[PDB]
């Protein structure tokens, strides 16, 4: 069994304990972008005897427009997140269920359906962390982001009471400053806080110390070695700055992403697996171990 | 009236003779889970004319930390039992009075409430049946699901002493094989087995297969036609590999689930009833209707 998650403060403790966890996020969950291969028992247990991974996130597509997402292919992608949500409880690892959508808050009754149902699923073990919107655009979080939070929130509850909650925020998840400014107020919820090494430095690190000042629980649900567009050259100061800032801040996090399409943020070398890293790979091993 | 059902060897006896009973299972009563419209006496009656079915499972959400449970609201899931219940009285049908729960180990006290409240107002009939723990998890039959069991059935026999008791096995109540291995000594009880037949094949057919052997019987209070993951679509060969494994064995079942929530499992389309089957509706409702019942 894992510890189970609380908020206190500006603080996430497992257990009624200070601490953090890392582990590697899936890639989008969509039929035919090519990561189905990866939503496995097996693949679940790999990020645990490789990278010694605490959790893993399962990030199923949603979107009216993205292809093979949950508005297309609603079986498929549920079957996948089931194998992996499994898994993990059988592997005594976190899970993080990623309603993967840019677009949450214009196709609520489609989040609402998705979380009473993850919530009937899954809400009894300690180990299912729900994330009910993972990049809010350039909208507002006190018009637009919050009440929709409020709402899948009480959902949820209604169904399963005890839980991380952790809730996206403005451009990208980036804005946790200004959502930090007018918190939700439920029990244990966490905010979003998602940053791309090659394209987000010290000014961004600055918004979340805002966010951690304002008394906000943050919680990196995503997070890249390399470029915003999840490409690119692995940048190795910024990367180790955004840890050594998660650190010493307790704040648990999933990188992105565990795939081998041929990109600088997956883990494997296209056709690759565990055994042909990319260089990005090759950091997040270390840092996921290192944890 | 209905016949007394008892236990003698792997065997469930109906008034003495071998044979078994088919229905549907209700969702989970649970207040604000959607499926509390269903807990009526016209749906019990209509389970008997649509589906010809002779058996219903009223499944009375327990979790302490599971919303509109009996912990939250007790009231209003016992009322929707004690509705589906005597209904199941008015129209000859067994009654399976299903103590929904992962966690009823864990939570005595209102196990021990539930069922002697349970046991004082429909003991008489013999149309009720006892399911005091709905599925197990990865937990100990010999260290945490037997001790439980007797205590539970120790508290129904003081009020009730003629029924037929079900207990949950480990793994979902898949593990009956385990359970067989060291029985319960009281008289007429049977074993939990629950499968989705888009998951389960004949290796969990064979777990089966081994605590039949091992001297218990067992009673499918719940399975699936689709994959266990709720969604899918039904596989009908599976399905009837398993059916045929019951027929043979007069192994009793009721299907998940009686409700309309969007999911492959559901005998209703959204917002529908028994003029609005989903495949697995379809599909069931050929099974029960042609059952014996
Ligand atoms: O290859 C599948 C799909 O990928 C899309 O881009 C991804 C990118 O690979 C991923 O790293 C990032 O996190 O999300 C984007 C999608 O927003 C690409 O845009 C699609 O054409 C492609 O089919």
Excluded: C
């Excluded at 919530?119 to 962390?129: C, F, H, L």
């Excluded at 296209?270 to 171990?289: A, F, H, R």
């Amino acid at each position: 069994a894992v510890e189970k998650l609380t908020v206190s403060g500006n603080q996430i403790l497992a257990g009624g304990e200070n601490t953090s966890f890392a582990g590697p996020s899936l890639f989008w969950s969509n039929t035919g972008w090519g990561a189905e291969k990866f939503y496995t028992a097996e693949t679940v247990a790999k990020a645990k005897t490789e990278f010694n991974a605490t959790l893993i996130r399962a990030a199923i597509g949603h979107g009216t427009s993205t292809g093979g997402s949950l508005n297309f292919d609603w079986e498929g992608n549920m079957s996948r997140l089931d194998t992996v949500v499994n898994a993990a409880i059988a592997e005594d690892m976190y899970v993080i269920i990623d309603f993967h959508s840019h677009e949450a808050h214009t196709d609520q009754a489609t989040a609402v359906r998705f979380f009473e149902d993850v919530a009937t699923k899954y809400g009894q073990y300690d180990n299912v962390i729900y994330e009910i919107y993972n990049e809010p655009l350039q909208i507002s979080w006190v018009n637009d982001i919050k009440p929709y939070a409020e709402t899948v929130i009480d959902k949820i509850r209604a169904i399963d009471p005890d839980n991380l909650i952790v809730v996206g925020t403005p451009t990208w998840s980036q804005d946790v400053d200004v959502a930090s400014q007018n918190p939700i107020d439920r029990a244990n919820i966490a905010y979003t806080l998602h940053f791309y090494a090659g394209t987000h430095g010290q000014s961004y690190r600055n918004k979340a110390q805002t966010a951690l000042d304002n008394g906000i629980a943050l919680f990196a649900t995503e997070w890249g070695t390399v470029n915003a567009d999840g490409n690119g050259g692995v940048n190795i100061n910024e990367t180790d700055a955004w840890m050594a800032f998660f650190k010493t801040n307790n704040i648990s996090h999933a990188n992105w992403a565990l795939n081998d399409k041929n990109e600088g943020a997956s883990l494997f070398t296209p056709g690759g697996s565990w055994n042909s890293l990319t260089s990005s790979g090759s950091k997040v091993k270390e840092i996921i171990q290192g944890w």
